[PDB]
Design a protein. Structure first.
Ligand SMILES: NC(=O)NCCC[C@H](N)C(=O)O
Ligand SMILES: NC(=O)NCCC[C@H](N)C(=O)O
Ligand SMILES: NC(=O)NCCC[C@H](N)C(=O)O
Ligand SMILES: NC(=O)NCCC[C@H](N)C(=O)O
Ligand SMILES: N[C@@H](CC(=O)O)C(=O)O
Ligand SMILES: N[C@@H](CC(=O)O)C(=O)O
Ligand SMILES: N[C@@H](CC(=O)O)C(=O)O
Ligand SMILES: N[C@@H](CC(=O)O)C(=O)O
Ligand code: NA
Ligand code: NA
Ligand code: NA
Ligand code: NA
Lengths: 402, 402, 402, 402
């Protein structure tokens, strides 16, 4: 009994959980985070009311998702375990934070979610909830015996049918999906056998690289403070100079050319290896563009220190520690390194690949004249000394193990 | 005076240097490292004799280049500054080591090279020479005033003409190339303006992704101890189970599909930023395949420690410290992590991109049953404790800065 | 019901737990790890039998504790959070491993321990048990509601009195102690207020530095492969050339001079900060001696890579991950670095401090002649080049943010 | 010819260099950095004028040395190679910066110093000079053939005698000293044999721990933002609440009790190992006090990230890169971590050792109640889940290499 804010999506799990928490005594507040997925939110709201929700909040959270979450992730220049661009992992603290906000506003003692007992997301939601509101209580049905021993997915379907929970007819895929503005992830079902290949009908956000356009899209991406501020199509003249709008245009450009597809096995914070395929179109373009622009504008030695911090950032976000003193310090250090990260990157998007074509920047650390056929401000005799003393170690070390 | 072993390639710089060291008193031993480039070595030998070389050594160094250099680089899973696969950087210690070997055999007091005063390669050659033979002497003409002030590239052409040094007619490109078995690099001339895009005729080793085959090549790559031992084409049945032969077939497959192209600005050991484009076809396939197979067969926590070592490996190789106690220790630690890195990766090569399709391994750390819709060996109640104590910090830290 | 191997010490907690597990249905095997503490093990055995133990194992585990645990810890050159020498943290995997060994021999389905619910040791025992024997079951009464809600320390005393559990008369100190061969730790009770100073009667293993001898003890410590193999007193001639015997002599020497005292606040694996004072006499001498000898015999760059691994080692041991693939890999890498770590360190032990006096080694990387008033094998002109190119960055970076 | 600012100390080397640069055509500006050493600066000024200096600048640089250099070094909590507190290494950028400032004011084209060709200090002076003023020119006589081949220390003495350069009568020690406010270092001569022990008359700044007071000094040190702001003697009531004054009082307290003595072999930026003994009295107290106060007030995970940065700081300072973008970024990150580092540490100074006695802070992350015999805000059942899922890896990893 009391009021619970449930992170609700409209699917079987969270439809059932709504009804279940209601059967258990709770007044349920259905909370629909609109984060760039393809939902008919109004109908999901109607469905939630029919199901017995006391209240429905649809929060459009896309712009702040781009600007407060995706932007620092690009600044980081880092990939979880050298492959994962963190699409879902970034979204959870964005979702959880608004959920806590709705709960404290409503005077609700409990929050709730439909994440499974073997996942990362359970951790991410709940670490942010406790971090931001130490006194909130969580109900995670998939970790409740009374719940998880009863619905041992076809047991859940039956539960739906018995309580008149509607099942869309659209029909089910033998995997689960997570979709937001940044990516789409597909993970259970048939994909659990890491020997088995994605069927072609799996890929919903990117074109098949064999069907993709024959002409590339050539874009110019402008950065300031490590994040994109402008996208212009060099050919057709299209321009976007606001965050969400440029990001979606990059999704639409990259998806059109089949860009952003990975197939990976990853290691889950609880310690299970999991097999996932991902579609991160815009994220893939920006990952590469940003690397090129920070490398052009950053000191060599700042960069290696900064990249260690990013690596740390990637692991903290993946495991669910966005709202922590350590990720806050790390985000601050990463932000600081990006002060001069600005300029323009020319890129080409074609057949499932992004290509860097050129770059320029008024804050460039590049010196065309110095690296030159012409001399210039350099003494070749210096280098001789530099080599010769770097070798002293090296010649010691040989003579003395000889 | 005395005998000098010159790392000779047959191009303008090292043709001129041969003649110059000869004019200076030295007996010149011309040393042609055959490392998978496209030279007519026999003619380069003839050219070296005509030029006044006392002696010519052509060393076919390809197999040991793959097995002793490229193999540990793949084990490392690392990229210099997140982009560079180290093609040229790996080759130098292979070349320098054989040069020192030829010099000590011949009783030659000096070795020599045609690397410029602003490069990485000068460092790599000479650090390995001193490391392996502390008493050898180096002649690096590009760092000698008597030499570099006189040939302030058209001054070098004149020198050639005046000493009857032949100039191929093939004509010059407004950039310099470095080619070996692993890659091709292009760097000076027009490419020095990082705003300027590679002209299409630049790309000699990879197909244009717009001209590349419409059907992919699907390959199965087998690893053992972190390095490829087998490549089989799933369609046409082609099989290679020896190191050099599988590597070249992967070059030929990846080059055919336009795979392995980068355009980057990098930071040079002497501290100048430089602009380079690279073609690393096989290297690009193996980079991705190996990542997938180590991730499937490696403990999560071994992996992050191991990846720090790889990062260290990448920097040590780039800067020229292959032959050092620190790179030796690092290579040893990296090798040790790879003991269980084995299995089979299914990959697709199409339109300038490599795709992972699936993987399997008898040393897999994957548990299909555990990660599953079915229960299994897991207690969902555990995770609740795991979350709740990970939050204790986190809730402390909020209350106490409140 | 069934048989349980209880890590038993003879104190109130584990005396009560013995009786409690017996009341609960279990046959209790009392397991006394002799690890260099000051117990009357035979009487603790008698006490355990009187209490209803089916069986008593006293295992003298000291020599293997020194040689398999303390030795790799010294090789590591690392301190948990720059202060803690890990005395108790090292002991647990030594104790747990023998416990699992006794349990599997006996055909016992369960193991048990008296560690509290807020500690590190619960984690260390149980992570090693599961790691070494995935199928064993743990009973940790302090985490059982039926147990911990009933004995909310005076409730435990009453339980003792009501079951005729003997209480020594020796009387209690308002803190808890953990003692082994390596150290003694004191932690709860009055010490929980980190503002409060240790009372003088707290310190049982080290002399008060104000009462300590006026003449120092000067010792020569010999290392091989990073671990001490010989201790000789320079004055009185005492010599120990076996592991356990030299270690105890160093405890006895350091304790005599008041060496090895710390007072720290540390952060506990579950995330609570805790206040602890420690006495690690021999450990403190060896920490300093070994640092001096590895620094004399190790390459500069091997050292920083190695020290990162040690840091990792310290955290893995503190948190309870000795028996893990990551600590195993790290111990292996650390061992490998120590191959040349050998020689002789002259040290002085006086008034709560250790002093390094000198050192020597046939595997020294020191060059007296080179570092010299005399020239020698060096070119001062080299250094000029080395400085000048290290500055190129540095001068770039100024001009280009000017 | 032209004007040169020489970092002058008044000793044989820099007295001779003054006269030599004058003989070579230059107008010499003698620059005496007063950095807390024991010079009679007025007489050194008189000596410099007699010697032919056009000008003499005595700069009292002590307060800014403490506040801008030593303070960030304490914030760092780090030791070069786990032993060296960086006394001399910190001073050089302080000295070099004022030298560049004097040179640019005077319109002097050149700066100069008497550091040897095999040292660290040559690097530190000159990297800061170039970093701060890319166009200045350096004269480093010890790297000039015309100079260093002529004064092959008794050749320098003769040079003095022949030019009427006064030699103090005080007589020479068979080692060189470097002294400032932070420490004293002794290094060449007899100490070059790392087997040889410091003679007792070597130690000028610290009492012999055998002669040191029988009663300790108990001090309370207050920190704010990671740096000491107050020192009060608990017994005698002495109080210092300004930076330089508290630092000197801590030198005077620690020196009185024999605190701050080390004997080490270190590895020099050019790659030679060197043997040095150091006396860092106040630095030693503050190193330990600050560690205790940051550990009490810092998040566990902020701390390990922060300590990596400090480690980086220590190496950047030792090698001479204070004035670099990477040390600037690192100092900024380190400063940021210290925002909450504040409170009071009770310490005891006795017989060559410092002891932590207690600590307190209004920004404490310590929770007496939580870590407690009393329950409190904790669920012991949580920890069971935390252990059990930390073991899942661990049990996997065993079954799958079984
Ligand atoms: N389909 C999903 O449920 N995706 C969520 C998990 C995706 C990815 N493994 C992650 O942990 O962020
Ligand atoms: N074209 C070339 O001369 N390539 C050699 C340099 C390539 C790359 N920047 C490297 O340093 O390894
Ligand atoms: N007195 C004790 O119970 N000592 C055990 C804990 C000591 C130290 N904090 C550790 O965790 O290893
Ligand atoms: N006596 C000295 O000349 N000391 C300066 C060097 C001390 C120490 N090895 C350092 O490099 O900072
Ligand atoms: N969202 C999925 C996967 C994950 O959380 O990592 C789950 O709840 O199981
Ligand atoms: N090989 C080229 C580039 C390099 O060495 O990095 C040179 O000698 O300048
Ligand atoms: N041994 C003590 C302290 C610790 O484990 O860290 C306990 O059980 O609580
Ligand atoms: N100051 C001494 C030592 C050093 O610089 O490290 C020298 O000039 O040689
Ligand atoms: Na709340
Ligand atoms: Na030789
Ligand atoms: Na078992
Ligand atoms: Na200037």
């Amino acid at each position: 009994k009391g009021s619970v804010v449930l992170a609700y999506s409209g699917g079987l799990d969270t439809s059932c959980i709504l009804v279940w928490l209601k059967e258990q005594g709770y007044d349920v507040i259905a909370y629909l985070a609109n984060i760039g997925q393809k939902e008919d939110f109004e109908e999901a709201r109607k469905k939630a009311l029919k199901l017995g929700a006391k209240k429905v909040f649809i929060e459009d959270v896309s712009r702040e998702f781009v600007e407060e979450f995706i932007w620092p992730a690009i600044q980081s220049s880092a990939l979880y375990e050298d492959r994962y661009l963190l699409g879902t992992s970034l979204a959870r603290p964005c979702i959880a934070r608004k959920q806590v906000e709705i709960a404290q506003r409503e005077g609700a003692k409990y929050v709730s979610h439909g994440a499974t007992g073997k996942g990362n997301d359970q951790v991410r939601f709940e670490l942010s909830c406790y971090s931001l509101a130490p006194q909130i209580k969580v109900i995670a049905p998939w970790r409740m015996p009374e719940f998880y021993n009863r619905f041992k997915r076809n047991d859940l379907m039956e539960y739906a049918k018995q309580h008149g929970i509607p099942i869309p007819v659209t029909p089910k895929n033998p995997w689960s999906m997570d979709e937001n503005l940044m990516h789409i992830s597909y993970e259970a079902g048939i994909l659990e056998n890491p020997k088995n290949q994605a069927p072609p009908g799996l890929y919903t956000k990117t074109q098949d690289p064999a069907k993709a356009p024959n002409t590339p899209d050539i874009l110019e991406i402008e950065f300031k403070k490590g994040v994109p501020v402008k996208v212009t199509n060099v050919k057709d003249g299209t321009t976007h100079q606001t965050s969400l709008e440029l990001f979606m245009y990059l999704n639409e450009v990259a998806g059109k050319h089949g860009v952003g597809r990975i197939d990976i096995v990853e290691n889950r914070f609880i310690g299970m290896k999991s097999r996932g395929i991902y579609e991160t179109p815009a994220g893939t373009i920006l990952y590469h563009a940003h690397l090129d622009i920070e490398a052009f504008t950053m000191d060599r030695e700042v960069r290696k220190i900064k990249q260690g911090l990013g690596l740390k950032f990637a692991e903290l976000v993946y495991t669910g520690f966005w709202h922590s003193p350590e990720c806050e310090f790390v985000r601050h250090c990463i932000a600081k390194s990006q002060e001069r990260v600005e300029g323009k990157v020319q890129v080409s998007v074609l057949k499932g690949q992004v290509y860097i074509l050129g770059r320029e920047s008024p804050l460039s650390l590049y010196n065309e004249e110095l690296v030159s056929n012409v001399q210039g401000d350099y003494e070749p005799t210096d280098a001789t000394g530099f080599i010769n003393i770097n070798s002293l170690r090296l010649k010691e070390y040989h003579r003395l193990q000889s």
